[PDB]
Amino acid sequence: PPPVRDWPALDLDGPEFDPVLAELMREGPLTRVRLPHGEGWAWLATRYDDVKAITNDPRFGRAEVTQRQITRLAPHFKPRPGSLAFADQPDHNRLRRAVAGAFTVGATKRLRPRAQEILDGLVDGILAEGPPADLVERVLEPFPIAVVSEVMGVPAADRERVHSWTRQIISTSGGAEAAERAKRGLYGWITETVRARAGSEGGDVYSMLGAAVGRGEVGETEAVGLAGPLQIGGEAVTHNVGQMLYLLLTRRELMARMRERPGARGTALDELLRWISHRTSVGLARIALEDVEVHGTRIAAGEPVYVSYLAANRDPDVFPDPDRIDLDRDPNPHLAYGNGHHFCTGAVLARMQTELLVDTLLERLPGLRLAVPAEQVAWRRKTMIRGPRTLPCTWHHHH
Numbered sequence: 075p076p077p078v079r080d081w082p083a084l085d086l087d088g089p090e091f092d093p094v095l096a097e098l099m100r101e102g103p104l105t106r107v108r109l110p111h112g113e114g115w116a117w118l119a120t121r122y123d124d125v126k127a128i129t130n131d132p133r134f135g136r137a138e139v140t141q142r143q144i145t146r147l148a149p150h151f152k153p154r155p156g157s158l159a160f161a162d163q164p165d166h167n168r169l170r171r172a173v174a175g176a177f178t179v180g181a182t183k184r185l186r187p188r189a190q191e192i193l194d195g196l197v198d199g200i201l202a203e204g205p206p207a208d209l210v211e212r213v214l215e216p217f218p219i220a221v222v223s224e225v226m227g228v229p230a231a232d233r234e235r236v237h238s239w240t241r242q243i244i245s246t247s248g249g250a251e252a253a254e255r256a257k258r259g260l261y262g263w264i265t266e267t268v269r270a271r272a273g274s275e276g277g278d279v280y281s282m283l284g285a286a287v288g289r290g291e292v293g294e295t296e297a298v299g300l301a302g303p304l305q306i307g308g309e310a311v312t313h314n315v316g317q318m319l320y321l322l323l324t325r326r327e328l329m330a331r332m333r334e335r336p337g338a339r340g341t342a343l344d345e346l347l348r349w350i351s352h353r354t355s356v357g358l359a360r361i362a363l364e365d366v367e368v369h370g371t372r373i374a375a376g377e378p379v380y381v382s383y384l385a386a387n388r389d390p391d392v393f394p395d396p397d398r399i400d401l402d403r404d405p406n407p408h409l410a411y412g413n414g415h416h417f418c419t420g421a422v423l424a425r426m427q428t429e430l431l432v433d434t435l436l437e438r439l440p441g442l443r444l445a446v447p448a449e450q451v452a453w454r455r456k457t458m459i460r461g462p463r464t465l466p467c468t469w470h471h472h473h
């Protein structure tokens with residue numbers, strides 16, 4: 075059995091691959107890791123084939139994780155009922171069916187025009203005020219929240235209440251207790267919002283959810299846990315695109331390639347998704363439910379195991395010269411959105427936003443460049459999702 079390896083919290087103000095994770099990928103297909111918080115250790119799968127398998131093995135469950143204190147990145151661990159993340163079948167399917175209809179390909183295309191308008195409105199503002207602008211604050215953070223709220227069904231006077239609260243995603247750390255305070259507000263709002271609508275119609279997430287509760291399909295108590303993650307989910311788009319833009323802004327050649335292929339950025343965006351280190355650590359582990367062996371290692375029942383989609387996305391057997399951003403790849407089967415039944419609920423929605431963002435920013439901010447040296451951009455620390463805290467930019471305004 076392999077020796078327990080410590081995996082400290084990453085402190086790197088850049089998009090570079092975590093050297094600690096690299097050192098693990100080369101130690102073997104499976105390694106035991108100990109994260110900053112929680113108890114003990116857990117197995118870690120680095121091979122694409124192994125990740126894709128475990129991620130799809132009925133023998134590994136998520137529900138059990140809620141019953142323990144598996145080594146994790148954060149010190150705070152309080153699972154909620156209704157969580158898609160911690161849902162095993164048949165509950166997972168039950169829960170998702172109540173909201174899935176709002177995130178389908180069709181719903182997303184229907185939504186695109188409204189999203190473009192919301193995005194153009196945000197871009198109008200910075201163009202009107204003039205050059206100096208922090209794109210994270212003025213575009214990457216508010217755009218997703220506005221679109222998701224649209225999908226969720228937030229009224230109008232509630233928009234600012236929900237946005238402000240959601241800001242509990244923090245810009246790194248503006249408190250902690252203030253984070254639990256804000257959720258005590260947002261979650262109470264979700265519960266009440268859902269209580270009402272309990273019988274109403276509309277493809278609306280909160281509407282549909284409230285309707286599903288009135289029929290005892292996804293009973294109350296499960297509302298917050300099921301919907302919270304969705305309402306806050308936009309943060310992933312904010313930081314993943316912040317990273318994409320950072321690369322475009324610090325590696326001029328990438329910006330150039332991007333600018334030369336309007337209407338054909340599909341492979342470029344998927345290559346950035348494959349290469350970008352989206353998270354600072356591993357997400358939620360899965361629990362062995364019946365003593366299994368993987369890629370030559372034996373995992374005893376009850377033992378936890380994390381998969382690394384990042385490491386997987388760099389597997390030399392699936393992606394030749396994995397550390398190079400060559401864009402245009404063959405199909406490119408990266409696992410940026412996960413795999414299995416826990417595949418990202420908002421993948422399609424997140425993609426539509428990403429494409430709008432990149433297309434609209436490149437066309438509407440002529441001569442876009444960082445307004446400060448990249449070295450001056452600090453990154454999010456002590457949190458799951460990685461990315462630039464700010465992105466000070468400037469662009470052509472006038473003679």
Ligand code: HEM
Pocket residue numbers: 129158159160177222303304305306307308309310311314352357358383410411412413415416417418419420421423424425
């Ligand atoms: C490009 C931006 C995004 C990326 C890279 C991303 C990535 C991921 C990943 C890697 C997982 C974990 C899958 C697993 O459990 O193995 C996940 C789960 C999830 N994501 Fe995202 N996500 C993004 C955007 C979003 C958005 C915008 C939403 C909300 C509409 C969202 C909602 C969720 C939910 C609800 C889950 C839990 C799914 C489940 O366990 O069934 N994600 N995402």
